[PDB]
Design an enzyme around this catalytic site. Structure first.
Site, PDB file in Angstrom:
ATOM      1  CB  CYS A 149      -1.038   0.024   1.129  1.00  0.00           C
ATOM      2  SG  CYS A 149      -0.460  -0.332   2.787  1.00  0.00           S
ATOM      3  CG  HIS A 176       1.304   2.990   8.261  1.00  0.00           C
ATOM      4  ND1 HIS A 176       0.275   2.176   8.689  1.00  0.00           N
ATOM      5  CD2 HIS A 176       1.575   2.610   6.987  1.00  0.00           C
ATOM      6  CE1 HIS A 176      -0.058   1.338   7.720  1.00  0.00           C
ATOM      7  NE2 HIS A 176       0.714   1.583   6.677  1.00  0.00           N
TER       8      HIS A 176
END
Length: 331
Positions: A149, A176
């Site tokens: 991703c 993140h």
């Protein structure tokens, strides 16, 4: 295209949500050796991040059933024992993260599937990123990987910047969201000590390969990019912080225009652009791989600039998996 899904974690379930909305994709089966049909139906139906599935979910002794589509389910530890050939499965999608090499994923082919798409980075399998190197896919390749991703967020932007101004060198930080490998309270995480610490009360520094992995999908950037990560207590949606030394002089205004053009043009749907006062939750369930934050970015000198791009680390990537699936069968 007739697909089967192996694994029913975050990626597995969302790939199923998205696949079920693709009119040319038929989801034939699901394999997960560690859940029963009622639990699978439950997990698919209720999602803390992306809401209730808008539709009717139920199950019988051999299926998960969604809005009239029966999806046969299997409880197989060895993917070779799966009836893919007999079920006439065009593409097996492996979301488990433990069948991600050319020799391990091969098991789906053995079982009968025509091709395999892997939802993690791979060492052996060629990697593809939509809007970056998909043209380089050829029909004889039976096992591919959709990369990661963060890779899907960095690569499309990096290509745009390099092609237009050149990247001499780049250092990246991803802020993140929490992931499944983390712990709710300080727990055991032998290979990654920091990653064991209370997820929701820490900024947690983490190592990540995604920046060098751009090297594999864009060979011209090998060894020019590396980075790191800070895991923070938001539940989903992450952001890339790219500090890049350019080759040609440029205004920030010029970077904006180039990226926006790419967003509206060839990268439509993969790369997004915004100028609005956005925050992470504004990207929940967004299907772009990368959303460029025009206002958040800052330029120091004409060859030294910081670029900011968002991504829904679960949903964008899962849409790309389904994009790669359709692309790979179109061949």
């Amino acid at each position: 295209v007739r697909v089967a899904i192996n694994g029913f974690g975050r990626i597995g379930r969302l790939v199923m949500r998205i696949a079920l909305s693709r009119p040319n994709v038929e989801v034939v089966a699901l394999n997960d050796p560690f859940i029963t049909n009622d639990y699978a139906a439950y997990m698919f139906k209720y999602d803390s991040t992306h809401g209730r599935y808008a539709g009717e979910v139920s199950h019988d002794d051999k299926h998960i059933i969604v809005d009239g589509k029966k999806i046969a389910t299997y409880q197989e530890r060895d993917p070779a024992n799966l009836p893919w050939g007999s079920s006439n499965v065009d593409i097996a999608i492996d979301s488990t993260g433990v069948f991600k090499e050319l020799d391990t994923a091969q098991k789906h082919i053995d079982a009968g599937a025509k091709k395999v798409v892997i939802t993690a980075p791979s060492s052996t399998a060629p990697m593809f990123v939509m809007g970056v190197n998909e043209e380089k896919y050829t029909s004889d390749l039976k096992i591919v990987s959709n990369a990661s991703c963060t890779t899907n967020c960095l690569a499309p932007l990096a290509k745009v910047i390099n092609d237009a101004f050149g990247i001499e060198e780049g250092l990246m930080t991803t802020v993140h969201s929490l992931t499944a490998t983390q712990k709710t309270v300080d727990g055991p995480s032998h290979k990654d000590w920091r990653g064991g610490r209370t997820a929701s009360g820490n900024i947690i520094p983490s190592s990540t390969g995604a920046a060098k992995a751009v090297g594999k999908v864009l060979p011209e950037l090998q060894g020019k990019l590396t980075g790191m990560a800070f895991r923070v207590p938001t539940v989903d949606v992450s952001v890339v912080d790219l500090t890049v030394k350019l080759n040609k002089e440029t205004t920030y205004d010029e970077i904006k225009k180039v990226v926006k053009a790419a967003a509206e043009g060839k990268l439509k749907g993969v790369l997004g652009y915004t100028e609005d006062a956005v925050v992470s939750s504004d990207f929940l369930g967004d299907s772009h791989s990368s959303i460029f934050d025009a206002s958040a970015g800052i330029q120091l000198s004409p060859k030294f600039v910081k670029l900011v791009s968002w991504y829904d680390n679960e949903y964008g990537y899962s849409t790309r998996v389904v994009d790669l699936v359709e692309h790979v069968a179109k061949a």
